[PDB]
Design a binder for this molecule. Structure first.
Ligand code: IHP
Ligand code: IHP
Ligand code: ADP
Ligand code: ADP
Ligand code: MG
Ligand code: MG
Ligand code: MG
Ligand code: MG
Ligand code: ZN
Lengths: 379, 393
C-alpha cells in the first residue's frame, strides 16, 4: 500500500500479454511480495471521470471520487461488478505506486515482445502513478486456460428496425467475424459460436471448446506454468495448423496421461461444471434494449438531441446497465489446472472486467451499424 | 454526328479541374441547349497492370477510348454503389481534331496560368462527353467539393503517423498547400462537420465554405460564376466579395438587404442535410478500408513488383485486387463534387419562401492505377510536414 516501484524494479517483470487498454507483465523475481503476481499497467492511446460519468455512476460515492484510474477500476470491480457476479471468482486487485521512470523503463523493455499494431496504437501511460497487482492465474505443473467468450445471447429488442432483423437470429460474434476479415484483422472466419458455450448444454460446451481450439483468434489461450503454448501474444492468432497441433500435443506430455482431445474434454467439463458462465450471461443480459435502443437514452443523458420520454433516472439506469453489460461481454475467464480416472483440481477466475467509457456509446452504435449493414449486404 | 471546327465558337469556358475542361453551350441547336461539354486534358486505353486490376469488369476494359471508359466506369462501377438517381454517366459525342484545337485556343485566355502550364486539351481524342448543365434548373446553383469526410483507423498506420487517426486529411493538407503557395490561408472548412450528419455541423460547414471557398465552394446564377474560383481555387471571401454577392442575391431571395447571404447558406445547409446525399458518398469513400499505408502493399503485389515499402502480402490475389479497386473507387468518391440547383424543396424561415432543389454528383472520374505510388508519397509528405509543425514548440 506504500512502496513505490522504481526504475531499478522494472527488470523484475516480463511481458505476459495485453488487450486494447492494458499491458500485463508476470513477476520473474524472488521477492515474496510479487511471486505468483502479475502487474497490469494502463496504456494511453498514442481525468478521472467526466461530469456525465460522475452522475451515471453516482450510486457509489467512493467510485465517483476515485483519485486516479487504477483506484477507479479497483472500486468499479469491487463496488459494482462483484455484487452482481460474486466474490468467489473475482478479484479487484491491489493498487501499488509506480515512478514515472519505472513505467518508461517497462515500456522500453517490452516493446519488442509486443505485436507491431499494438505498438502503433498505444504504449504505457507514463503519466500514471499507480498500477494494479493481481494473482497470476496461470499458476495454480500448472496448465492454464483463458477464454474470452464474448456475448452469448441474441437481441430481442422492439427497437431493432426492419432492415436489421438479422441481428435477431445471428450472433453479434458471427456477424463481426465477416467485418474483421474485411479489415484484415483475422485470416479465417472463427469456428467458435458463443451461443453454444452459453447454451448450458454439455454437448454444446464441448463443441464450443473444440471450436476455440481450432481457431483461437483472441478468444482462447493455453499456458503451461505461465508460458504461452496455444494462442496469440497480445493479439489474435491464426487457425491451429497440424504443425501447431503437433507442438501442443507434445507440450501436453506429462500433464495428461495418454492427449489434446483429453485436454479439451477436461476444459469443457470445468466450464460446464462450474456453471460460471450463467452468472456472466445474466450480466451481459443487462443490455436489455440493444445499442439500437440504448443509444437514444444516451443522447437524452448528455442532453443532446437523438441524431438517430422516459424520466432521467430511467435513462440513466439503462445506460448504466448497458456499460455494466459491456464489461461482462468483453471480460475473460482463466481456468487453472493441477494434477483413466486421472483427476484434476481447478480454479476459475474472471479477468478484464474493465469500466467502459460513457463516450463509447456513440462508437458502439456506429460499430453496430457497420456490422449489420455489412452483414446484410453480404447475404 | 461530329462537332467540327465551326462548332467551337459555340462553346464557352465554364471551368476545369486537374483532368477535364468544361464548356457550356451558348448556341441555338436543340441538341446542346442546357448542356455542358467535358473535354479530357492531356498532362504533358488501359495499361497492362490496369487490365489485370479491372479484369472482373470486361465491359470496362474493352472500352474503345477514354470517354467510353469513363462512361462505363460511372455506369457499371459507381452507379451500383451510389445509386442512379443523382448520377449521370453522360453521352459520348464525336469531335474532330480541329474542333478540339479551336476550343483549346479559344479558352486559353480564361484559364488559370498554372492550369495552362500543366496541360491543355488532348486533341488526340476523337470523342467528348455531354452532360446536363446543372446550373440550369432564375437558377442559383451551388457546387460543393466536400473531400474526404472520415478519419482512418487502420492497423497499418505506424506510431509516428498516429496523428492521421485524429486530424482530417483535409486539415493536414492545408498546411502543406499553404507551404507550396497553392492557397493564401487555411480553409475554415472541416469535412467532418459536413459528413457528421448533425444539422448544426452541416450549417457550420456551409458557413465555413462561404468564408473560405478555396476550390471547395462555388455558386452560379444562371450558369454565371458569382462565388468561388474559375478553373481553380480562390481566396477568402472579403467584405467587398461579400457585398457583391449579397447584392448578387437581390431578387432570388426576397429579404431585407444585408440578410440575403445568411438565408442563402441556411438554404444550402437544409438542402444538403435534407437530401442525405452525403451519407451514401461517405460509405463509398469508406471503401478505402486500410488507408493508403495499407493498400500500397496490395498495390505492389498487383503490379508484380517486390514491395519497396506480412499479413497483407499473404492475401489471396482476388483479395488484393479487391482492395486496390476499392481504394481507387474510394478515391473517386473523395474527389467528386455535388451540384445543388435552386429555383424559386426547401423553405425559408424568415420570409415564407419556398425553393425547388435538385442534387447532382459530378466528377466521378476513374483514377489511374499507377497513381497509387504518388498517393503514397503525397500521404507521406503530408503527415511528416504536419508532424514537423507540431514539434515546433
Ligand atoms: O483489441 P482486441 O483484441 O480486438 O479486443 C478489443 C478490446 O478488448 P480487450 O479488453 O481485450 O482489450 C476492446 O476493449 P478495449 O480494450 O478497447 O477497451 C473491446 O471493446 P469493448 O469492450 O469496448 O466493446 C473490443 O470488443 P468489441 O469488438 O466486441 O467491441 C475488442 O474485442 P474483439 O476482438 O473481441 O472484438
Ligand atoms: O487540381 P486541384 O484543383 O487542386 O484538385 C485536385 C483534383 O482535381 P479535380 O478535383 O479537379 O478533378 C485531383 O484530381 P485530378 O484532376 O488530378 O485527377 C485530385 O487528385 P486525386 O483525386 O487523384 O487524389 C486532388 O485531390 P487530392 O489533393 O486530395 O489528392 C485535387 O486537389 P485538392 O486537394 O485541391 O482537392
Ligand atoms: N490475473 C491474471 N493472471 C494471469 N494472466 C492475466 C491476468 N490478467 C490478465 N492476464 C493476461 O494478460 C492479458 C491482458 O490482460 P487484460 O486485462 O485482458 O488487458 P486489457 O484490459 O488491455 O484487455 C489477458 O488476456 C491475460 O491472458
Ligand atoms: N454537369 C455539369 N454542369 C454544370 N457544371 C459542371 C458540370 N460538370 C462540371 N461542371 C463545372 O466544371 C468544373 C470542372 O468539372 P470536373 O468534371 O470537376 O473537371 P475535373 O475532372 O478536371 O475535376 C466543375 O468543378 C464544375 O464547376
Ligand atoms: Mg481483455
Ligand atoms: Mg479491457
Ligand atoms: Mg472539379
Ligand atoms: Mg476529376
Ligand atoms: Zn509490403
Amino acid at each position: 500500500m506504500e512502496m513505490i516501484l522504481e526504475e531499478k524494479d522494472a527488470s523484475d517483470w516480463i511481458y505476459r500479454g495485453e488487450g486494447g487498454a492494458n499491458l500485463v507483465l508476470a513477476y520473474a523475481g524472488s521477492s515474496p511480495l510479487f511471486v505468483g503476481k502479475v502487474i497490469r499497467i494502463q496504456k494511453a492511446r498514442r481525468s478521472v471521470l467526466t461530469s456525465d460519468e460522475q452522475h451515471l455512476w453516482r450510486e457509489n460515492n467512493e467510485l465517483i471520487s476515485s483519485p486516479n484510474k487504477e483506484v477507479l477500476e479497483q472500486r468499479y470491480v469491487q463496488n459494482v461488478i462483484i455484487p452482481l457476479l460474486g466474490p468467489k471468482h473475482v478479484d479487484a486487485g491491489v493498487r501499488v505506486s509506480v515512478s514515472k521512470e519505472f513505467l518508461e523503463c517497462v515500456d522500453k523493455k517490452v516493446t519488442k515482445q509486443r505485436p507491431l499494431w499494438r505498438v502503433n496504437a498505444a504504449n504505457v501511460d507514463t503519466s500514471h502513478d499507480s498500477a494494479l497487482i493481481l494473482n497470476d492465474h496461470s499458476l495454480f505443473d500448472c496448465i492454464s486456460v483463458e477464454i474470452k467468450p464474448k456475448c452469448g445471447f441474441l437481441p430481442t429488442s422492439r427497437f431493432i428496425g426492419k432492415e436489421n432483423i438479422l441481428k435477431t437470429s445471428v450472433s453479434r460474434f458471427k456477424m463481426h467475424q465477416l467485418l474483421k476479415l474485411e479489415y484484415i484483422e483475422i485470416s479465417e472466419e472463427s469456428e467458435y459460436d458463443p451461443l453454444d458455450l452459453f447454451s448450458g448444454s454439455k454437448e454444446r460446451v464441448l463443441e464450443a471448446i473444440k471450436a476455440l481450439y481450432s481457431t483461437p483468434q483472441n478468444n482462447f489461450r493455453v499456458f503451461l506454468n505461465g508460458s504461452l503454448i496455444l494462442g496469440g501474444s497480445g493479439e489474435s492468432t491464426g487457425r491451429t495448423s497440424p504443425e501447431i497441433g503437433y507442438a501442443f500435443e507434445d507440450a501436453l506430455k506429462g500433464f495428461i496421461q495418454s492427449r489434446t482431445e483429453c485436454f479439451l474434454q477436461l476444459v469443457s467439463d470445468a466450464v460446464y461444471g462450474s456453471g460460471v458462465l450463467d452468472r456472466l450471461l445474466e450480466i451481459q443480459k443487462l443490455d436489455k434494449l440493444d445499442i439500437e435502443g440504448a443509444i437514444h437514452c444516451y443522447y437524452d443523458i448528455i442532453n443532446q438531441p437523438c441524431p438517430i420520454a422516459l424520466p432521467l433516472d430511467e435513462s440513466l439506469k439503462i445506460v448504466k446497465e448497458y456499460l455494466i453489460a459491456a464489461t461482462a461481454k468483453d471480460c475473460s475467464i482463466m481456468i487453472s489446472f493441477q494434477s483413466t480416472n486421472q483427476t484434476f483440481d481447478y480454479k476459475v477466475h474472471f479477468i478484464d472486467l474493465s469500466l467502459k467509457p460513457l463516450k463509447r456509446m456513440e462508437s458502439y452504435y456506429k460499430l453496430d451499424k457497420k456490422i449489420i449493414s455489412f452483414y446484410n449486404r453480404k447475404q
